[PDB]
Structure formats: C-alpha cells, structure tokens
C-alpha cells in the first residue's frame, strides 16, 4: 500500500509513543553517548583491542545478533565465537572497568532512544527539499542520516539543545544528498551553484529587456570572468539527458533510438576497405626487410603511434635510411601495381 | 502474478501474507519464538509492530511523568522505588496518576523538596557525604534527642561546582513492567545465570542478555539490580529476508507426498487448493531447477551500449531510460549500508528497505 504513508505513520508513531522531552531526555540520552565513547576509548586502553572493534562488539549486543553481522558486513568477524572472546575480556575487567562496560551498552542504546524521537524532525526540515529532484523518503533519509551525524557530535557540556544542533546536521546532509543524487551525470558543487547563479542571473536580466538574454547579458551581470563561451557552454550542461526513448514526429511508435546512426561499427563499405588495405599492405611490406619496415609498421600499427626510440640497436641514420628507403620503394612500386592508390580512405 | 509463485508454494496468505511483510514491516514468526500472545508461538503466523513490541521489551512501557513537584513526585516515590508495583496501582495527585500494568517500578528525576534514598547523582553536591561521612548528620535537628538528606535544599539535575552543570524539570514516573532481582546467586548447573551476590555479574549489560524463558538484562550498579525483562529469541522478520529463509527450509519431496495425499483424500475444498500447490512444487521438482532462486540478491544490469549514452544538440545527451531506475536501485542500496553502518535505528532501516524494494521493481 502507498509508501509515504505507510513510513509517516510509522515513525510518527514510534514518536507519539516517545518524543523527546526538551530537555531531560535529550540530555539524558547525550550524556550517555558521551559515556559511552568515553567508555569504548578507556576500553580500548585496556584491552589494546582498537576502538573500531569495541564498537562492533558493543553494538552486536546490544543492536542485533549473528543475523545482523553476517548478512550486512560478509563475515569477517567470525559470527559466533569471535565477538563472544571479545565480551568475554570485558567481562573479566573487574569492578573498575566492567563498569565502562555496561556504560558502553546503555551509551549505545541510549543513542536509539534520541535517533527515533527525532525522525520528525527530520521529515518536518526534509519536507521543505521536496522540489530538488529527490524524492521525498530519499530526501528524509539522507536527512535521517545527517541526524545520526549530529548525535556523534553533541557536545552536552556546551547548553544548547539537540534540536537546533540536529537542524544544520541535516541540513547539510539533504544539500549534498541533492547535488550529489538529482541528475544522471555527476557535476561538482561548484558547477552546481554556478548554474545557480547563471540561472537567476538570467531571471533578473529577464525581468526588463523583453529579450531573452543574448548570452552577453548572462556574462556581465554576473560578473569577473564571465564571458559567451561560457554561459552558452554551461547552458549546455544544464539541460538534462532527453530520454533515447520519446515520442517522435507525428507522435506514433517512432521511437527516436532508430533515427540516431551508430560509428564504431564498419558499416559494409569499411570491412571492404580493410580487406583490400590490409592484404594489399600486407603484400608491400614483405617486399621491405623487416627491420625499419616492421619497427614503423609496430610501432605505428601496433602500439603507440620516436625515431630514436623506435629502431633497437640501430641509431637514427640507419632508421631514416631505412624508413625512407623502404618506404618509397614500397610506394613507388605500389605505384606501378596501383592497388594502394585508390584511397582506401 | 495472481498466482502467487512464492505464495502458492509457502503457504502464506498467497496475495495478503505476502503484501503485508514483503513491503512494511509485518514480521513473520520465523524459527522459535518461545514467549506467548496468549497462545504458542506462531510458526508460520504474521504479527504487528505493536504486539511484536510488546513481545520484546516486556508487556508495559508506561511512562507517566508528573505535574509541578510536590504531589505526585511525592505519591510516586514513596512507592516507586523496589516496592512492587501491582496493576492498577493507584498514584495519588494529579487527577489519579493510574498504572495499570504488572511488576517493578523506576522513577526518574527529582526536584527538591525532601531528599532520601536516592542515587549517586546529588552525595557529590551536599558535599558532607561524599566528601566525609556527614549524611547522617545531614539529617538536622533531632538526631541528638542508603540516603537521608537535609530537610529541603537542592532543586535540579545539576553538578554543584559552581552550580554551574545544570538542567532545571521534569520528573517521570516511567513503569517498567519487568522482574527486578536485587541479590541473585550462583547455581552452575547450566552457566552462571544472572548474578552473583555482589562480586560478580555474568549477566550481559542493560542491552539484550538470555538467561531462563525470561531474556532481556538491563543493569542498574545503582542497588545490585539486575533488571531482567523477559522474552526470548523471537525471529521475527520481515520483507525478503523472511521468505528467502522459508524458501530454503522446505523439502519440495514432503510437501509433494503430503499433497498427494491432501489431495485424493479430504473433501473437494482445501484438496482443491492442495492440487494447485502441488503443480508448482512438482514443476520445481521436476526436470525443473530448483525454488531458492525467486529470492534476488543479485540484480544483473543490462549491458552498457543498450542503455546509450548519446550526444544529441549541442549539449544535449541522451540516455535510455533504464538508467534512472538503475541510480534508483544503486543510491538506495548504497545508503542503506551506509544507514546499517553508521548506525540503525530501526524505522530508518524499514523506511529504506521499503524504497530499496520498490526501486527493485
Ligand atoms: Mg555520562
Ligand atoms: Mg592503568
Ligand atoms: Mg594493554
Ligand atoms: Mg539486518
Ligand atoms: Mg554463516
Ligand atoms: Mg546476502
Ligand atoms: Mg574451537
Ligand atoms: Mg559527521
Ligand atoms: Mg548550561
Ligand atoms: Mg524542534
Ligand atoms: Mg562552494
Ligand atoms: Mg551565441
Ligand atoms: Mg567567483
Ligand atoms: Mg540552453
Ligand atoms: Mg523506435
Ligand atoms: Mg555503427
Ligand atoms: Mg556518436
Ligand atoms: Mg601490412
Ligand atoms: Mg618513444
Ligand atoms: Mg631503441
Ligand atoms: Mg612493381
Ligand atoms: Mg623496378
Ligand atoms: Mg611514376
Ligand atoms: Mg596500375
Ligand atoms: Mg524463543
Ligand atoms: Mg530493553
Ligand atoms: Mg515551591
Ligand atoms: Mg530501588
Ligand atoms: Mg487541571
Ligand atoms: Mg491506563
Ligand atoms: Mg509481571
Ligand atoms: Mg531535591
Ligand atoms: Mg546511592
Ligand atoms: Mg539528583
Ligand atoms: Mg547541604
Ligand atoms: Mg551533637
Ligand atoms: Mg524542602
Ligand atoms: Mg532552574
Ligand atoms: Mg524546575
Ligand atoms: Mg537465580
Ligand atoms: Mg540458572
Ligand atoms: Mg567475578
Ligand atoms: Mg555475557
Ligand atoms: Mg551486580
Ligand atoms: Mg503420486
Ligand atoms: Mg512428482
Ligand atoms: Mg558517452
Ligand atoms: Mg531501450
């Protein structure tokens, strides 16, 4: 059944059974963030184990089981008894840091209760980037995960709240997520804003000449080095890829994709001319001696189109001797048995 | 299709069990799930988020938090902490604070009219029983004729430096319905469950931890209070994940004899539907290839030169239109890793799975 709702009423949901309380809970569940990275470092400290694996642990207990593990990441981590051994020495560390242990855990679940409370938030911000070019739950998404973004980062200690913290944590998530995502070919911020720009550049200039801008317009008013070759070379990335499939002329199963001709396939009249060229050339250059003939006739037809370079122990003079030589004695035979001639292109 | 492939074979409700957990999130009950609902678990049966978070937290999530500070954070306390609260318990001051569900209760904050029996958080501000051993004196005036503070002087959750780490509110009366063990011991028949008196704690933390039916374990050091909640390992999942397991856990061969027999014997009706799921399973179990395969989880792209990229006018490119579907399926997927890394909560990750699902199609 028709997903937006279905996904609104659920976190929506969950939030009207939990938002957050303004302060207490955002603090709450901040502060035993906090812990908990203060917790996983310490344990690291003890256990010489990296604080990426203290993360993976923790998380293993108190997120999900083997099923979590194995499916997402492949099993690098052994499902079973590889995270066990790793709880196993957080269980032995006595009074002391078993306590960074059982902090770590609640760190962690902590950390869900603020994630869920805050998912209005989210879609409230993510409901006004609609237009972009991103849809809707892709949007509240990317903003879902700049949220996340912001939880790693709250710094309790400094008064203000999570809400406006969350606000730019988002905000900059759903920004990229657009310029990242929205078009079929990838192009920079920069050329992003640019276009921007340009863009509203031309709704000023559009805004009293009655003329459409001539492309000089565009260059002035925006401004330094801003010159025709450009605008009309950024006009042209602008527009979007038309589909390979659209309606044509008097709009009937004409689908554009058989009027558009095709290159690299040697259409009849170039397999022909391959053939005559390639024997015929093939005849020429076996009445030369291989030396400088096969050294131009690789180092041209093989790899990389050097005269230096190109012959072996053999100098240059003997190369330009050689090339030469061969080379118009090939042609001009080739020239008596005129079969090279005919321009085969 | 409308026969359902896979809804004919797993006998799910062929267009409606499918629907349900395919796209949201209505959970089958896949392997055991011991807890009830009122009944044994369902094998093959399909639940709601709402039951199912019933079924794993504990039967009460009941978060009543009171009004000013007097009243009710009076009512509340007196009877909050380790005094088992019955259902219905009556708290006493606003309209009638009513918590009507089963067995031990967590208060959270106070304000500051009178101090007793509370955690750690305020010793370190009336520095007297932190710093030396003053609490008992602490009590004021008739001491000449676990906690007790002075008569009324601290108001919020604060650390009193300066009284300079603050925060001023609420105080919830949050019910947990769940078993609260204080000083359990240690049997080692099965491994050490739970507790040790004080010394030892086995228990895994205040996340998830199974011991007897009984499965959750959160920890308060606060008292040695070992909160045990209690359900099991209920696989509960939903989308493909759920029918890919399914799929693979069924001997065609079985179902194939068990429909033979459904089918001539039995009346017309349910021998009907037997004899339409027994020409699928037969097809698969014939010179057929095998059925784990309807499930995809690896999606073949086309090739590259029949979804062009073209040079049309100017600058105008053109693209067959598969590859906007194609972006679809690859961001999707690829932010959902990025969600299950970073972190999951889980409406985030069913939100996703969902518009990843769709995208597949
Ligand atoms: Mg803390
Ligand atoms: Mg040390
Ligand atoms: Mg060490
Ligand atoms: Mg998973
Ligand atoms: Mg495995
Ligand atoms: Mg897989
Ligand atoms: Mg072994
Ligand atoms: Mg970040
Ligand atoms: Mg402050
Ligand atoms: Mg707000
Ligand atoms: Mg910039
Ligand atoms: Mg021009
Ligand atoms: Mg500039
Ligand atoms: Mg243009
Ligand atoms: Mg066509
Ligand atoms: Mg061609
Ligand atoms: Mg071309
Ligand atoms: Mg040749
Ligand atoms: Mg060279
Ligand atoms: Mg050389
Ligand atoms: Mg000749
Ligand atoms: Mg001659
Ligand atoms: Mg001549
Ligand atoms: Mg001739
Ligand atoms: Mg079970
Ligand atoms: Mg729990
Ligand atoms: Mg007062
Ligand atoms: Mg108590
Ligand atoms: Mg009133
Ligand atoms: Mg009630
Ligand atoms: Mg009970
Ligand atoms: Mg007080
Ligand atoms: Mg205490
Ligand atoms: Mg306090
Ligand atoms: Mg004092
Ligand atoms: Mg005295
Ligand atoms: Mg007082
Ligand atoms: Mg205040
Ligand atoms: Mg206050
Ligand atoms: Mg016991
Ligand atoms: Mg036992
Ligand atoms: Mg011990
Ligand atoms: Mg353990
Ligand atoms: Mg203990
Ligand atoms: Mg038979
Ligand atoms: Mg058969
Ligand atoms: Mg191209
Ligand atoms: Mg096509």
Redesign the interface.
Known sequence: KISTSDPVRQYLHEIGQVPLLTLEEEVELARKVEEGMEAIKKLSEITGLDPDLIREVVRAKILGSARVRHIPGLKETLDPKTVEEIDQKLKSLPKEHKRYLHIAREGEAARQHLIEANLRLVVSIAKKYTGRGLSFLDLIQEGNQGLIRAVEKFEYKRRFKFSTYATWWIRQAINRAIADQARTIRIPVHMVETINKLSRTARQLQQELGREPTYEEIAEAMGPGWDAKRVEETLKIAQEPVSLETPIGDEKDSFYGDFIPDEHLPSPVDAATQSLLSEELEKALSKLSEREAMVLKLRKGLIDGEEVGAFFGVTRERIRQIENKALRKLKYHESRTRKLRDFLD | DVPSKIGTLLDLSATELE?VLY???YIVLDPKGAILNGVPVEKRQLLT?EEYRELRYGKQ?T?P?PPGVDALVKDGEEVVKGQELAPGVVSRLDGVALYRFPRRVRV??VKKERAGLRLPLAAWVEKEAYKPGEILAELPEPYLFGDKIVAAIDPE?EVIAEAE?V????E?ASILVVKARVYPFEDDVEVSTGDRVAPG??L?????VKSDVYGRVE?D?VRNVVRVVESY?IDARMGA?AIQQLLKELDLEALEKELLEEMKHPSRARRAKARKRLEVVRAFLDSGNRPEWMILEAVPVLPPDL????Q?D????????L??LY?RLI??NN?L????????????I???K??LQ?AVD
């Open positions: 629907q796209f949201s999130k988020d999530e978060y938090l959270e904050y959750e780490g925060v001023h509110l609420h919830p704690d086995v895994a933390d205040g996340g998830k920890v050091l390992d994940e979804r062009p990229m073209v049309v100017g600058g105008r490119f053109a693209t067959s239109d590859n906007d972006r961001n999707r932010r890793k990025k969600l299950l890394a970073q972190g999951a909560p889980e409406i985030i069913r939100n996703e969902r518009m769709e």
